[PDB]
Amino acid sequence: RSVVQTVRSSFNNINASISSINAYKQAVVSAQSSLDAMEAGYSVGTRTIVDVL
């Protein structure tokens, strides 16, 4: 019964990994575009390079 438990749990964990990867990918794209935006902000210097960093 134990290994039944374990294997199901494993399967489940894999699915969780999938969804998480999805989420973080999107977060990456987002933060990137935000970055480029603020970079453009420094293009006329509205901010500071630290902010960019």
């Binding site: 989420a23 999107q26 977060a27 794209v29 987002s30 575009s33 935000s34 935006a37």
Partner: protein, 53 residues
């Protein structure tokens, strides 16, 4: 162990439903923000933000 495991199911049901309601709420948040970009009120970055949410 019996009592513990019994309660855990309940708690899981709880978190389940709650996370669900959260899902819908954030969902129409994204829809609103999306439409708001469609009329052009806001930067794309916010769109990606709500996306990430």
């Amino acid at each position: 162990n019996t009592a513990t495991a019994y309660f855990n199911v309940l708690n899981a049901i709880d978190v389940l439903s709650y996370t669900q309601a959260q899902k819908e709420a954030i969902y129409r948040q994204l829809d609103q923000t999306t439409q708001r970009f469609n009329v052009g009120l806001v930067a794309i970055t916010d769109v990606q933000n709500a996306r990430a949410q």
